[PDB]
Ligand binder design. Structure first.
Ligand SMILES: [Zn+2]
Length: 362
């Protein structure tokens, strides 16, 4: 194992998009610096380093891209975990201040845990002039063949490489676009009460401040999220993941707000109790939960919705207006209008009647 390299046991430990997470918060970055120009035979300078905080040898390339005569640089990152909340912002600053440097980042695992500032930092880094993509078979093979000391051993992938590297691609697309996919929305937000294959739960949310005598939308605070799930790397539900993102808003305690939650699946009993116990401790928030389908939760969901509404939560079923409003704001439509599926108003009124029955104690 030559110094400055990673033996195969270190590669197949950091660059592995399988569910397993990072209890040991370690990241490993491989960098390729090239002189921008016409040369297809340009000498690419490769290096690699893992996060070592004290001295930071992973940033030993920032001196390799100093402005030197009329030379531009192309940098290619093969980073293990997604960049940090502060590292991404600092790299955006550096890309803004150093115009002669272009950067292309390849991510193996995205930071599953989120924070509005983290998404903001990734989007600002993308705006700065960087290109972020998820590693697939080509990138994993190209990294194994130039940053791993393999004594002849060829690259052997895992079972679900593309199956995970495409889910992470969709996650990154949702993160960078600030809008989810149109097919994803037309799939998850369905109106029929009994469906199949809707394992994940998507949740959009809007905030409105009470100014003058009017709810004014805090348009800089709207956003969506999805559940985590999976195993072998557990995860919370979408409602609980929304109850975690609220403290990062720095809400004013003297004024009142209205928070609207557009949910694909209605909250279960655990999430309903957690939401009730949250809004009971934050009386400066009026929660209105507009849902698409009514999640039965094996029976214990009607009582959960009843308990949630007894604290002061406006539970309701999405109609055509709410579906179209969710289309024009949270999905990547690119100008296309909302074309609703057949039966929208029918299942809408049916689920409204069933919710009214549930709420009239039934
Ligand atoms: Zn739940």
């Amino acid at each position: 194992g030559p110094l400055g390299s990673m033996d195969p046991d270190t590669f197949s430990d950091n660059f592995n998009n399988r569910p397993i997470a990072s209890r040991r918060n370690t990241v490993y970055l491989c960098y390729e610096v090239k002189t921008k120009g016409p040369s297809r035979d340009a000498k690419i300078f490769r290096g690699q380093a893992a996060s070592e905080d004290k001295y930071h040898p992973e940033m030993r390339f920032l001196s390799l891209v100093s402005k030197w005569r009329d030379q531009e640089y192309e940098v290619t990152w093969y980073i293990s975990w997604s960049p940090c909340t502060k590292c991404a912002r600092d790299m955006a600053t550096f890309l803004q201040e150093n115009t002669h440097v272009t950067l292309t980042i390849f991510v193996a695992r995205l930071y599953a845990a989120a924070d509005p500032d983290y998404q903001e930092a990734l989007r600002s880094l993308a705006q700065a002039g960087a290109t972020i993509k998820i590693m697939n078979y080509d990138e994993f093979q190209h990294c194994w063949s130039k940053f791993v000391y393999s004594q002849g051993a060829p690259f052997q992938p895992w079972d679900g490489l593309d199956e995970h590297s495409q889910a992470l691609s969709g996650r990154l697309g949702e993160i960078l676009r600030h809008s989810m996919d149109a097919a994803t929305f037309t799939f998850n937000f369905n109106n029929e009460p009994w469906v199949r294959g809707r394992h994940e739960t998507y949740l959009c949310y809007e905030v409105e401040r009470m100014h003058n005598d009017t709810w004014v939308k805090l348009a800089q605070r709207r956003g969506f999220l999805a559940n985590q799930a999976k195993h072998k790397l557990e995860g919370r539900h979408a409602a609980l993941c929304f109850l975690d993102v609220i403290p990062f808003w720095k809400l004013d305690l003297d004024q009142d707000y209205r928070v609207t939650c557009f949910t694909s699946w209605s909250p279960c009993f655990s999430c309903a109790q957690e939401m009730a116990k949250f809004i009971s401790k934050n009386k400066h928030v009026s929660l209105c939960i507009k849902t698409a389908r009514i999640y039965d939760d094996k029976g214990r969901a009607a009582e959960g919705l009843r308990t949630l509404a007894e604290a002061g939560a406006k539970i309701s079923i999405m109609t055509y207006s709410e579906f179209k409003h969710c289309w024009d704001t949270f999905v990547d439509h690119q100008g296309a209008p909302f074309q609703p599926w057949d039966g929208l108003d029918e299942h809408s009124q049916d689920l409204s009647g069933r919710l009214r029955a549930i709420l009239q104690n039934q």
